[model samples]
Target chain A: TSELVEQILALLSRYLSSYIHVLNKFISHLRRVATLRFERTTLIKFVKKLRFYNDSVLSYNASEFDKVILPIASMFVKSVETFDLLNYYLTQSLQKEILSKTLNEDLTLTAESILAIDDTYNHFVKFSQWMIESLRIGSNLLDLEVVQFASEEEFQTLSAAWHSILDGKLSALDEEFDVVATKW
Target chain B: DIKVTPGTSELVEQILALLSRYLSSYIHVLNKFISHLRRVATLRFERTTLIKFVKKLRFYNDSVLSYNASEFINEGKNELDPEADSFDKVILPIASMFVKSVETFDLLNYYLTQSLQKEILSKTLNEDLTLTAESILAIDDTYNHFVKFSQWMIESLRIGSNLLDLEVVQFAIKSADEDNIFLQEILPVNSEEEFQTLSAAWHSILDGKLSALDEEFDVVATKW
Candidate 1:
């Protein structure tokens, strides 16, 4: 069981690194161009890169849950029954060690760690879902007909394009919400 | 060989109860943080506001980790009884639960800290107003933990109770229902019969009946 936990932590760590890289590049690109307008091809390429990342993130999230999280959760649940029949008898030293640890040590740490990992996985999945939606919106917005710009003279020409995209996009930007709204 | 006495048996049961409650308490503390993060994620906050929230989260996580580490170290320093041997039935189960809970909590802390480090803090520092997928991921995690905790609580309750407690079972059921709407939708409850079945099955299991519990667990398994 500890082996399973280690495997999950390792897998998530790798995936998290990948996730951060993709996110950094995505955000960095947006920041670099926040004040400037670029060619349609550049915008389209950015959208395509984001789309790839979006798909990968979602796929990883679902795969990990199905392949790892569910299996472990189920395994742990089944293991609970074994506790009922666990051998109570132990060697003198063993019993002393176990009892001493239980009485004096903070044994709750193990449970806390599991709960934390479970939370992290769930949080990652939720974010991936939102990212998927956001990416889709971004891709569509970039695909708009009037999405290119050049110099100050052409600023007027691209101003309409900016308005068109911004009006359609930014209005719903604030719509992204966490699940707590439903309860509290 | 160690002799088993009635006094020892009662002592074991008390320790198991305390340990069980201790595990539950740790999870509750986690939920408090989870709930706070979820609520905060919904609002648009300034850098200072987000920073304050992040600081609070950091403080909570650090406190838990340090407290656990110190306790373990302190316990290790204490001398063990030379003549202690034999054990009560509850010993292995409680120990197993304790081990698993600690592992679970460690995993949670790792992910949350990673989320804060890579996702939340980075975005805040960057002055990016857009909410990252990571924040949402953390929020979704809370609900998952809630569901898992509910099931564990129910199972623990079964261990502790010889007679079924309807109120406690109902509370777990309701909590699971609220925490995961998808579970509620698929595992619908139109009548009292289903809950009665669940309670009855658990009651049988509590009395050393295994097959009935397994069968009922299979039914519940589909939804879970």
Candidate 2:
């Protein structure tokens, strides 16, 4: 049952990634979600790319990577890509909205546009931690003495560690965008 | 070691395909429905008839208020015919009924708007703008329950066949006189919570705050 649960977790992780992909496909089909259509669309676009980084890490010169380096590379890409979105949204999406002077006297942008920034802003503080956590994990994984081998303990650690990163960001995505969708 | 189920792919494929089609068409329905609502919202209404219209609308608010989406879906998980595609056999038909019910709601709403415009028959009459926006917000809350319900079904499927569980209730889903859609049973709701859903939905419309609740159609629509 324990192995079954782990397999289920691994299976779910795979399914979740694929699910995210399908959602990206569905984003194009979205016509009316009241007014959040654009933000929802924007969110799926970012996630599409974020998930892409994970797959991209795996496919690159698969034969060349030692087991020791693989987890490092995976975390490297995920951390970077997560930050890429986090930074893009904050600087480009959130700050742009925060800095802009709207025609209305009130201190707010259009509801849809501001919330897109809001969704994008989540990647800022929370995702920064995710990024630092990735770097920390990758650094420790690198400290191992191995040209081509992952120690049994290290193997288990990486498995759990990788799973932790996967669990964190995906749940974060769910929280951020799910709010955006409902508010629609 | 865990033994993986091989045949489940067919079940998942069918589920995703069915749900994929469901999401596409639902958004299309909402778009047309919103368009339809705007037209009626712009129309003039007599104060007395408007009061009557609001009264009926309140009745409907309770109608779904009595709908228990979570409980209904939990029951939907119980296997009725394993031999038949459970998702198609149980879930799809029920979802269509809900969809059709929504379709019917919009039509009924439009027809009632027309009733306000007509003068050939003697009726209550006064010049006043009504709370047509209320109905749009109302429809959105209905959609929220539905999307939340559908989200659970897909997650349940992946977990259970591997996972969990719809319906034609008169107020939420009127299955009467329609030969096509069927419901084996219906669910109930916690009515007290609706005030917040109503006010929040209303606030989103009036204040332009477009955030989500528990589920998202496109995003959760992916969990297959």
Candidate 3:
């Protein structure tokens, strides 16, 4: 019977160890997707701004950060923040609670203490599952490349628009281009 | 790629168009899921279930904690009553709450798995999507855990044609309790004091077994 108490404690220790590891990996996954993987979309938006440099908009540029980066970055920042909070809470508070109580040689694994930990673990997994689903859905949204959205002719028009924008860049810095040889 | 056998081409285009529409509904469910998650995270009617679970756990702990050789040794020579002491009242309700929570959680995981699997499958089928190895491993592990959970919580507790309901587990506890109570009432008191002694001893055994059941159920139900 006492052995069963040992069984439960050992199982819980292992479970907590693995669970914290899982959360760290998950947090890293979100961080990578948010920071690195989204660089392409950022570049796509910047290139898109440069394409319409002169002809399109009246106001100069609300181009990049306000409209593009921060909104998506802010969402993942909260996601990372919550999970990081949970990771440390489990490490410092929960794991410590279990270990401190167990360190006493005379300790009996009471039903209440076990249930308390169980409830915390249950709620943690439930929230983590939701977070993963959100991540999974967000990931699928990114599978489309920039070219996939436009027809070949539409891309041809975009490419031509880029050539026009490039010429205009040199035209405005016209005297500066004398180093590269002057254009008509 | 445009072609004709114009009808075949039209059907293919229709599929492509409808696939996009299907994608929207798929996305809508996820959007609704995210919306609920945000409200649940923030609006947070925190701990309604937590309180309910703690209430049940308290009742269960109080009932089972006292079961031991000492109490039963007394009940051996004395009368057995929940009023004098039967722990049945404690077991049934707490077990019911945990069992019910397990049921809804299983249901939630079941649908959540299907929703994710469908999205992954549809995208993988049509797109050049590549899944990370870690994501694949995580998916498999979660599914494996859910499958085992369903087996134990649903299959064992529901007890195949032992009738399928969450309350069946509660009834199992009630029946175990009543069996002990009925045995004690009919059997003569003190005619064999030491004989009732074994009954007292045995009641603890029953209590231990029932506690065993409760702990295992709670483990599966909660601490996934």
Native contacts kept (model 2): 0.00
> Per-residue alpha-carbon lDDT of model 1 for B99-206, expressed as tens digits?
333333333333333333344444345323223344334333433343333344334333222111122223345476444432333232322234335534533433
> In candidate 3, which residue ranges exceed 4 Å CA deviation?
A1-184, B1-82, B120-224
TM-score of predicted chain B, candidate 2: 0.26
lDDT of 2 at A61: 30
Supply fnat for every model shown.
Answer: 0.00, 0.00, 0.00
* Candidate 1 docking quality: incorrect, acceptable, medium or high: incorrect
Q: Local error of candidate 2 at B17, Å? A: 51
How far residue B219's Cα lies from its native spot in candidate 2, in Å, is 46
Of candidates 2 and 1, the better by lDDT: 2
What is the number of residue pairs that collide in model 1? 28
Q: Residue-pair clashes per candidate, as listed?
A: 28, 20, 2
Measured by C-alpha RMSD in angstroms, how accurate is candidate 2?
21.0
User: What overall lDDT goes with each candidate model?
Assistant: 0.31, 0.34, 0.29
- B1-224 in candidate 2: lDDT tens per residue? 11112333333333333323333333433333333334432222222222332333333233333333222222223333332232222233233223323332333333333332242122324222222434345445554444444433322323211111111222233334453112433333222133234424533342221223112322322321
